[model samples]
Target: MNIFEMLRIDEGLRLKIYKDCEGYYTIGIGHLLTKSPDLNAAKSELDKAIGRNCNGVITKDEAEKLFNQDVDAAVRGILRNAKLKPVYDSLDAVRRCAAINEVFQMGVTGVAGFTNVLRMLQQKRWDEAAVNLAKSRWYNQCPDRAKRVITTFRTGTWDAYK
Candidate 1:
């Protein structure tokens, strides 16, 4: 399958999700947490929530309950007052994007292309020289079109000094 199909990814949506993660992590984790009056307790509580989530022991319902119970009684109210609802929504989008990437394939070319690159890299005789020659002939100026560039460069036994 192609990277899009494997990862179930939409480039447009992924861009949006990336933006959301950057924005939310900055505003919520950086701005509010830093400037809040109840700095110590606020940080401690947030850290606890993060720890619980990271340990993979949390259910969605339980997480929401925990957030409401520890962070604030009126969860919605706090989010609204902090102007964090949009950030939260963005974070949710990021989560879905990550899940899609993890469950599916990622990138443009796909698995066969990946394998071809691996084969080249494994060839002790002359994969790089062959690929560069192919690039000159078939791909015009686009060296990436030689295929499997990532796998070849990463897995190849040849050293840079050689």
Candidate 2:
């Protein structure tokens, strides 16, 4: 059975995980899962449920076992359909540059910040959302340079920031 299949994901809910070169696994939970708990907290709970050492490199069998382990509704809700990807071409900018200024949260805060910006945009608050998106740049841009990081999370490219 698919490891993600165990959770019985609800419609409109999806999950994904990213593994960086630093051996950190960043799990991406859709907004649907964020309704249950803070992303960080939910990820912590998942770590416990799947065993601390499990990380994101477990075998399919191990994943099946982990999924079978009893988990709280909220956590189960969060783990459904989690997907993982390597820090892509764009995210690498955030990893290398942002890591110098502040301990990079593996762009977790950046992801959340993007989500907030998108949410505001969806509410038709384009101006407000644009402001928030700009604010998020403070965290994602290079401290000493005007370079913007993690284009994939934004335009899916390294576009010049106006």
For each candidate, what TM-score against the reference? 0.18, 0.22
Output the number of the lDDT-best candidate. Answer: 2
Residue 1 of model 1 has an lDDT of: 33
Candidate 1, 1-162: lDDT as tens digits: 332321211211111011121122111211112223443544454456556422223344543444334223233332443232332233333232222231121212222233333343234324463453344322343233223322233333222212
> Candidate 1 lDDT (Cα, whole model)?
0.29
lDDT of each residue in 1-162, candidate 2, tens digit only: 211321222111223444322333433221111223345654665566556644433455444453334233222332331221122212334222222212122233334335555454344454564356456544334322212332313442323232
What lDDT score is found at residue 125 in candidate 2? 54
Deviation from native of the Cα of residue 13 in model 1, angstroms: 17
Any idea how many clashes model 1 has? 3
